[PDB]
Design a protein around this ligand. Structure first.
Ligand SMILES: CN(CC[C@H](N)CC(=O)N[C@H]1C=C[C@H](n2ccc(N)nc2=O)O[C@@H]1C(=O)O)C(=N)N
Ligand SMILES: CN(CC[C@H](N)CC(=O)N[C@H]1C=C[C@H](n2ccc(N)nc2=O)O[C@@H]1C(=O)O)C(=N)N
Ligand SMILES: CN(CC[C@H](N)CC(=O)N[C@H]1C=C[C@H](n2ccc(N)nc2=O)O[C@@H]1C(=O)O)C(=N)N
Ligand SMILES: CN(CC[C@H](N)CC(=O)N[C@H]1C=C[C@H](n2ccc(N)nc2=O)O[C@@H]1C(=O)O)C(=N)N
Ligand SMILES: C[As](C)(=O)[O-]
Ligand SMILES: C[As](C)(=O)[O-]
Ligand SMILES: C[As](C)(=O)[O-]
Ligand SMILES: C[As](C)(=O)[O-]
Ligand SMILES: [Zn+2]
Ligand SMILES: [Zn+2]
Ligand SMILES: [Zn+2]
Ligand SMILES: [Zn+2]
Lengths: 129, 129, 129, 129
């Protein structure tokens, strides 16, 4: 079910996306929890050349703070869309940079659940053998 | 040239990259100034699928703070490499998302100089739609 | 167990990667089958800003021939690596542009098997517009 | 001017894009000349994670054929849009993978002109340099 740390991430990313002007360029926020308990937030940057999803912005934000390993991450869409699953590219970046991470997604009953990244990319390509 | 604002960007970005462990994944920092005078920082996230350069992380960090227009931006590499010119992808995202921005690059003498983004993408493709 | 049309894909992509110079930039070949019976090939283009995987080159090659809907796709690595699973970015693009497609991956016994793209991106992010 | 070589690359790219159904996903074609006397074509694959531009599909298609060095490249938009300049990400990939290449862009009078790739990325970021 819904733990406190999980709930806090959802709350943090929701507040971030709700606080900013409605935009088609900046339309999703993410929040991640680090091993040491810090939370890092970000929003996406839309671009046809592969502007970062919100989760990638969060990864650079976390790395800028020397956060180390991230344990959980969630993305929240604008306009009351709620939890969005990480896109395939996010999943690959997460698997390669934070193999221990979980992402919050909606389960088969619509309920938020924290899932190991490996389960979100079955038979995953692993970069560098 | 070298007006206090830009000198400060170089300082902030240099401080950011020197404060984190040496890494091949997180190896460049960026700092941008917003129109209202705030500074935003970030580091890159290396990935073969196009992990964001440090400047793209900065864009998403500024956007998360509702910073609006960014007016200047610099990237500083780790291991005392100093100023790095924005890559071509960065130039395109900057042109499209912050067309009034300047990027700090090195001139012929290897001295910091702030250049209009359009001068870094001569005959630039301008994204419509 | 697979079919024999999917077997043809493996053979074609194997022949492709073994017919070019060994390269760190161009290291994977792909082949896809169109509903109209044609086979399209491609090799990856490595770049830190997100050079396309071999599958994405295949998509553009198929599109350039007005192929329509692709039904199956496989990647074969150089250094005699055999089948590589689509990376998470490939999976997202495939889900979004050819939602009916299957990808050939290695099963537990190390043998080629065709899997629906949706199975490779569970709880998938649904790109709209 | 309009050299026979320029004119042919433009015609090849134009024919390619004009030959496929009008599409928001596949909307630009590219053609490149190789030093070994071949021409390679491709169309873009639009995706928010950074689906390749037409030029990158061309690079993977050239690589698939063991083309080696490409000497000139052009992109042509659908719906009679004519020549499109390479986007900044294309300029970066081209500078890094084919530093000798020229791109066809429009000049001040709207006429086709071939320019060295380095002219399109002044003060260029030099990958692993
Ligand atoms: C023409 N456009 C593009 C408009 C597009 N409809 C914007 C768009 O589709 N953005 C989406 C792209 C990235 C993104 N995304 C997706 C999944 C995820 N887990 N994290 C993300 O940050 O979510 C955004 C979202 O759903 O609004 C612009 N001028 N920006
Ligand atoms: C094998 N690798 C990749 C190692 C690569 N050498 C890392 C690399 O080349 N990173 C580079 C990619 C992005 C980047 N970059 C470049 C220009 C710019 N204006 N901003 C940036 O953020 O700067 C980085 C840099 O110069 O170290 C990993 N395991 N990470
Ligand atoms: C130093 N480098 C980078 C060398 C890198 N090791 C090359 C590299 O890892 N390329 C990888 C990137 C893309 C890619 N790829 C991956 C999965 C997949 N399904 N299809 C692909 O085309 O597979 C390649 C592969 O496994 O050699 C260069 N200058 N190229
Ligand atoms: C498929 N789409 C996106 C619709 C977009 N308007 C399509 C779009 O803008 N595509 C553009 C993206 C890439 C691209 N491009 C650009 C420059 C260049 N030198 N080569 C290219 O291949 O050219 C395309 C073009 O001008 O139609 C959605 N479902 N949102
Ligand atoms: C690691 As958790 C309890 O925030 O999904
Ligand atoms: C702060 As400035 C003059 O480098 O755009
Ligand atoms: C022929 As098949 C099952 O690999 O799409
Ligand atoms: C074929 As050309 C003249 O644009 O290098
Ligand atoms: Zn993503
Ligand atoms: Zn960049
Ligand atoms: Zn891929
Ligand atoms: Zn491009």
């Amino acid at each position: 079910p819904l733990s406190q740390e999980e709930s806090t991430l959802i709350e943090r990313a929701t507040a971030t996306i709700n606080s900013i002007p409605i935009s088609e360029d900046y339309s999703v926020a993410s929040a991640a929890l680090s091993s040491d308990g810090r939370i890092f937030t970000g929003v996406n940057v839309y671009h046809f050349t592969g502007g970062p999803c919100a989760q990638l912005v969060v990864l650079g934000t976390a790395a800028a703070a020397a956060a180390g390993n991230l344990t959980c991450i969630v993305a929240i869409g604008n306009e009351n869309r709620g939890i969005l699953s990480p896109c395939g590219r996010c999943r690959q970046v997460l698997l390669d940079l934070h193999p221990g991470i979980k992402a919050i997604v909606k389960d088969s009953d619509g309920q938020p659940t924290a899932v190991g990244i490996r389960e979100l990319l079955p038979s995953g390509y692993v970069w560098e053998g």
